[PDB]
């Protein structure tokens, strides 16, 4: 019936990616899902699925599919996974304990690091309390350690975000990685995205 392709090509090959705290969420519905483009190793540094095996995605059907895009440090890729405890997982992008989907990452030393410093990517390191899964805090409000109206340039009034600063010649884990998280939903609704 439906002969439409999904825009997976325009999510992975997107020209520019957002910061993790402002992570993008794109809906996928009413197409056919060709995952063959993902089984290209030596491109994707990490490709790990939870609740499904990556090798049998083309046989399945879902209510909607969600694609999350953001950039994190290489050492921070490890905590984009259920039940992790780092800064990014606690304050920037939380996955459910019962997460059903795939996490894909690939190195972007080429396109997101410069000899001068690429500080255009930010992350939140200060927050009153952790994020529920799939929450997204986009606020930039001065942070006081004891929860009070905080009006800098006063004391104990602090800013919640921090720039990564990616460099071309630095450690492997200090290099920037681009991440796409695929989420599969399976509601009481008919499945609109299926394989060939």
């Amino acid at each position, epitope marked *: 019936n439906i002969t439409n392709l999904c825009p997976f090509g325009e999510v992975f090959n997107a020209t520019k990616f957002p910061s993790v705290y*402002a992570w*993008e*969420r794109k*809906k996928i519905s009413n197409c056919v899902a060709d995952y063959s483009v993902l089984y290209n190793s030596t491109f994707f540094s990490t490709f790990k699925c939870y609740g499904v095996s990556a090798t049998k995605l083309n046989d399945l059907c879902f*209510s*909607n599919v*969600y694609a999350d895009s953001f950039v994190v440090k290489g050492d921070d890729v490890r905590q984009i996974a259920p039940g992790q405890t780092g800064v990014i997982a606690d304050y920037n992008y939380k996955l459910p304990d019962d997460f059903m989907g795939c996490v894909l990452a690939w190195n972007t030393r080429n396109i997101d690091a410069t000899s001068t410093g690429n500080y255009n990517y930010k992350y939140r390191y200060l927050r009153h309390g952790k994020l*529920r899964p*799939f929450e*997204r*805090d*986009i*606020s930039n409000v001065p942070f006081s350690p004891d929860g009070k109206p905080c009006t800098p340039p006063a004391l104990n009034c602090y800013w919640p975000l921090n720039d990564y600063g990616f460099y071309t010649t630095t450690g492997i884990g200090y290099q920037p990685y681009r991440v796409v998280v695929l989420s599969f*939903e399976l*509601l*009481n*609704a008919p499945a609109t995205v299926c394989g060939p």
Partner: antibody
Amino acid sequence: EVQLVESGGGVVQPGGSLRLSCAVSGFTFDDYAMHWVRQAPGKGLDWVSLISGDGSYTYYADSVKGRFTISRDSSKNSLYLQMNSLRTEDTALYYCAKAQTPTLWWLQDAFDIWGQGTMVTVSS
Amino acid sequence: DIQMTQSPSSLSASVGDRVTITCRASQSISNYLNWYQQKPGKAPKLLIYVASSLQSGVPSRFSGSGSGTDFTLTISSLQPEDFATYYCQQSYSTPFTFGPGTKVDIKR
């Protein structure tokens, strides 16, 4: 067609409690996040609270947090808003609103169907 | 909270006119702005859903555009049933916030 019938409203003392109800029809209730939007007499639209399809996720506006509680009943295809510690500023017409996209997520959506309103008037 | 403003607060036009209403956010809300219409004494009806997408049943004359912080709602040929108040709403983050509304009334 989708119907959002609302009931519960009335006149209540400051400090009193009040529970609101919204009985739905015309769509698979559990697939859509539900919302409450209130409108004070002569003023604009003010969002109040949301609940996901599961009921696993709920979020409240700062003005009502700590005293309003939102819930849904799958078997009764109904949405509820328990209001406690009411105060005159809460006096508004309360709409029951449906997210158009059938998702277990709550953001980046619109409100495609609105019920007609139940009036809450907090005065002594 | 993200602050939604709308310009102008009031607008007077006639049937057949082209009407253009501005809505602006204090923050990037990407494309997640919705446009609603409310006639006096009745519930809001949804008109535009992701800054540009037209809701089923809404007449073709309505259209929206914009991304980031600047958004616009346009009616190409005004109609007698189009005289109402128009609100914009961001869905990028909770709590959701509405614009103050723009009232469109009959020129006289």
